[PDB]
Scaffold this active site. Structure first.
Site: not given
Lengths: 170, 172, 169, 172, 170, 169, 169, 169, 172, 170, 170, 172
Positions: G51, G133
């Site tokens: 994939d 983040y």
């Protein structure tokens, strides 16, 4: 006695089955040919894993010795009937296990699967087998003329049956 | 006590499942026929691996002894309901684990899976379990007549259930 | 008599079978091309597992040493006939076991399988074998002309048979 | 009369079979449940095409109207036996065709297929058929008790049979 | 009346089934989502051709007009129970066919499949459906709280049942 | 001679084949159980499409009317033998076409397929057929006892053969 | 910096992966239902081998101890965006490795895979993670309302992103 | 209101679907690459027939003219959220049908499927559409930066949502 | 000398075949490209197991050392011809085994398989082999020009053959 | 030197391939992504077993140490061309094996497969690689602008070629 | 003449192929057995759709009449050789098409597939066929003794060839 | 002029593709062998349906006459490049459509598919096309020597390319 049990047939038990299935004295009682490759036996076991129309059991004692086999086949779920067949390995024939096993198979049939009728087939030429079954509750419902070819001849067999009502009200 | 752990059933747990699936007494509480070759069990296990309508959990203790099984089946995506069933291996029964596991199953069903309703069936002739379940907050919603043929005769079972709102909000 | 038994062929007996199939003198008796691969033999074995038109048996003694092979092929269930083949490994020939194996193959065909006719083919150039089959009750029904190409030339074979009625009476 | 012809069933006869397989009255004589989608019938037909344990024949008249079906099942290669069953479409019943077809089936079983024994089952409550079969040489070998559940209750059936030696040699 | 019959569902009937299955008023009575592609319906029909656990019937009158549907699902052959469900197309609701069909389904269940128990589910908010079933012999064995989400809300349903003994001794 | 041709069997010829297979008197010549399903015949046809061990031919006249069938089976490529079978539809028997078809089957076996031996089986109770095969050069090599169960009893058949060398010289 | 490496996930790393997936507190970070079977995990691994819309990596230290996991999913090759996920096993948290793994996932996305945008989701109730983040250059682009059902109630998550241009300049 | 209905997508509706998918201006609303083959569309349709994670519906009027399409994708059954998409064929826009279709998609999501949250994406450069969604009760929860590459450049989209509780009260 | 034995190739001989199939010198005598992963070899081996158009034999000595390979290919069922090719492992070359094996192959082809004709191809630039083959009764029936590209250039090969009648009847 | 050989890639060599394929410094020279699960690599090896359009070789010395890799891909049999690619494991870079391997690959290409043309790709930013190839006979036939994205940037590559005639007449 | 063309064999042309393949006079020239079921022919056509080792052509004129067949088989892409075979339907034999078709096949072989050598087989007993081919450039490279069994006898055939260099420098 | 429309190739366009794929002149511009049975074409078409590495477009006019084909192949997901190739049916050639279609392909590649680079190959002996392509903004990045064997000899081709940044930003 108390120490006899019925559990489902498993792959690991197939060498014991094979050994019986390739013994003509043993297979004559099931009106079956005494030739079966191990591979035939195993491939048919694989094919019928999910078949609801049969239950195959191995019989053991307390030390886990394989005593014989119990089978319920042609289970029909409208008519609620099935054919019972049993084999006791040679070494264990004549010890009185027979009646216990028939009872256990009837108990499975009648207290678990909820069947209405169990029938079996016996060689007319084995009249002591016939009587046994009569004492265990079975009754003759037919005398099949030359139904099976066994040992070079066509032989007659009794078809015998027992109903759930009779087994549970005992 | 608190040392129990849940994890999903996996292939290597199947000899244990098989053992229980061939035990007449254990299976009567699940209204299931006590006959299953290992092959039938494994083949069906394999087939349901990605089946979302079920969750099968095993219960292990600190040293990894397999204690029991907790399952949820007939999980419906719309109605958000499922049937709960539990089994505790006989050697580990009567040790007060039932409550603990029933609560883990409720906590999973309602705080993780976000179901709205869990129900079970219990034999009427098993009043100790009915009671246990009531104490764990389940409530009788039906008395099914002659629903299952068990050990020679037709028997009644209680259907009991518990809602997520009730379970989550009780202490509030 | 007693010591020699017959049981169905098994995957574990295949190296024994393969070994006979590489002796060209042994395969000349079955008019079969020798030197076939073990994989071909195994895959053909796998394919015929449920084929009801054949029965392949092995012959074992008291100590479970493989003596030879007995087979019934082209079993026809309307005409109830089949072709019989037998091979006794070379290290066990001259021990007088052919007779017992033939009688055993006939017993199986006629008392279990309920066949009516058993036939076989034998090279005319093997009059000892023909004679043995004659003693076991087989009768010549055909002298097939140049039927098989064996060791560089076409040879004649005998076709011989026995009926159930004759074996059972 | 003599203008009847037997041939093997084939795919294009299946709408006729389907029609009979969904007729309650017709199927009760075969102890079979009267429900079969066309798809179940065709799929099973397809699956048994090379199955040697059965023969299914259709009966046609001179102008090709499908009259009935003659079948032999459970054909055993060793015991050389089979179960015979017959059906005559209702619009063509009571026209004296039964005997003619029973004899064609016997002639096939014994002069072509080389069977040793043919048997059938007939409801006890169907004495006209029992009689018909007796006249056609079949003989009662069993009275099966409560063998089939039919139209609300368990019923007895006669098992009747005929041997190849008897059939072939009677007039000799 | 006499002119109503039950026959097995066939492929040719799937356009009628589809048309009902994509009607939310009709599917709410089966607690089923009213969305089904024709292909989903047909592929599921194909998959379940040999499933013994269900019987699906179409209902017609004498001219062969499709009146509705009868279904027996979750047929269990140890416990000998099954769930009954019925749908009458809108055009045919309120004509008195309901009782005939329930009777026909019970007759199939009890005089043909040899089942012991038939149960069904009905919205508690449809108490006239409840009564009908009571007059046809069914009895309430449960009141399922918030069992199904239907039309923006969780709804209660009665579980009702009838036994073979009662249907046949009437 | 000329008008009658032989070409390989085709799927479109199957209804003709099926029709012969339902005449039990016609199938008695092949010792084949009559009354077989069209679907069985078609699926068996599909399965043997690439089977090199058989050749099935149809016989067509000048107007493309199907006369009968000629087949070669059990073709063996080491022994180079095969079994010959022939069926002439009933509406075309007595027209004297058997001879031409036999000669045509032999021409094919020996000038194209390069076989060495062709054999066939004939019921002993059909001495006309035996005689026709004798005129076409076939010789009896076997009288097979109770080989087939036909019309209620076991019958004997003749096995007859011809070699390539004899046909080509 | 140097010691920590990233390589593709391998079948032999699956027991490590499974073990994290049974910690419900660890799976709450991925909003993934915990307690999944090893067989489901393995079979899903087998199915996605080729994939191209995902990359699953493992993080190994100098001694080849598995630290955690970094994944890129829903990789879109027209829009050139992907979702980033990271899990650091509990026995390796507080060691200050998150930063290095994030920087490593961005390096991969932007210098090898040539993506334009990387985004992630973080529970609002995890302001420490949001903050980490933010330091690595991610900016909030969405405050998703009641997006996930976690520990018994619906929670809000932040969606945060960084562009290739910002990371490379 | 009444005249417009919604039913599941069917194989016979695929040419209608394909036709919208070739209008690049129509596909820009779904951020989907236009110009896809009919065979790809059909085979993808075949593959998702039983996929429970999506519902694709068609919108038909009283005369059964296909108006547009409504879909629910990424349906998640734990979080009970799904993404909503809608396309109204160009020959039926400006007829005021968007509103009715949105309300119909919400009715389905919340009264039948029992979902908790429905969200969608809209290009920021399409403020008319944003406004329509605002009137139907959707609220912006995200302004996704350069999320999609459309007509030669990266564009921002709005993510907007509505909850079941708000729609049902 | 006489102690050589032929048997059919089997799976367990494939590491030996592989070794030869990747040897440039050995394969140039077969005009074959010297590259074959074990997997290509095994997969093709498996595929041709029941292929009647070929026979592949291995040559073993009394103590089972694998000496060489004898093969017949393009076996035609009508024309009764085949192409013969042989390889002797390099460690066992120049030991006078060639003749012995060529004769075993001829004996097999003509006294067992009943072929009419065997042919081979030999590089013209390999006159020792041409000669050897002539002495073994093969005769040149063609000089194929620039037939194979070998070690950088196009080369000529002799096609040589022998008939069954000649071989069987020579001494008569 | 003499001790370097090219043999076909085998399954047992895949751990060495994998190890190189997951090394970004090594894969940049093939303009390939440095991520490949072992399973991806093995499944692609299985899929291409019978592919005639490529030949993959492992390079060893006399003790059977894996030195690197040679590959011929996009073999076209009308145009008789193919792309050559090579990798030398890090440990073996800078020992002079490069020229021997290029020669061996050209020999395979030209004395065995009978190809007419071999071409390769090299980073313009590796001008010492370019020169090497020029000394081994290759000549620039193109300067591909921003052909490959490598290490955060689009890079130019030379396409270089050599013909059979030139290799064999040397 | 100008109006003759070679195009790829298609399924629709198989009835014409079949008709030739079941004509023994026509198949003797290909040393092939004149028996082929249509199904054998079609199934082999299906199987070889992607086979690179052969090219099969049908020959037509301007009105699209099927004149015959051209085939290139055993195409080998290292040795760059192939076997050419041709058939002209009976009706079209003796009209001078032969040379045009051989030329067209050589052109395909040499200006398109880039082969080095084309060879064919001809019955020695057809010496006028031999000469033709000699005039078209082919030369005898072998006289195969009793190579094929045809019409009850083993027959000798010439193997003839032509090289690309000769065809293109003409 | 402006009345041209692009859509993806679909099964029903294959007779048209087949026709071009068997035309020697047309295929020489694509360096492809001009032989393809309809079956090979359809089977490969079917196989590549979900293949992301390619896009195949057909060009139709207002009344739906099939004019030509525009394709992009070897689409690489990382390097964001593809090879462009075009064909205009001969009956519709020399009508000034080339430019229009080359621009539609560029517009698709760069404004929809977001590729960075498009390249093509053109025979050197086809200077009219080289020129046309240059005018459409492509630039020679290579002169491949003896790359393709076409109509009897080895020929050189130009590799030409265009970048997305250049194309999008030119007029700015």
């Amino acid at each position: 006695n108390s120490q006899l049990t019925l559990r489902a047939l498993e792959r690991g038990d197939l060498r014991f089955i094979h050994n019986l299935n390739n013994n003509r004295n043993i297979m004559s009682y099931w009106f079956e040919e005494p030739y079966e490759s191990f591979d035939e036996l195993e491939e048919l076991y694989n094919k019928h894993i999910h078949d609801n129309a049969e239950r195959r059991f191995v019989v053991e004692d307390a030390q886990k010795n394989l005593i014989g086999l119990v089978e319920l086949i042609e289970i029909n779920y409208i008519h609620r009937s099935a054919e019972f067949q049993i084999i006791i390995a040679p070494e264990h024939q004549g010890k009185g296990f027979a009646r216990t096993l028939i009872n256990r198979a009837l108990d499975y049939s009648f207290t678990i699967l909820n069947l209405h009728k169990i029938y079996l087939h016996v060689a007319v030429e084995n009249p002591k087998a016939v009587h046994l079954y009569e004492e265990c509750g079975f009754v003759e419902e037919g005398h099949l003329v030359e139904e099976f070819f066994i040992n070079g001849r066509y032989q007659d067999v009794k078809r015998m049956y027992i109903l759930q009502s009779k087994y549970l009200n005992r």
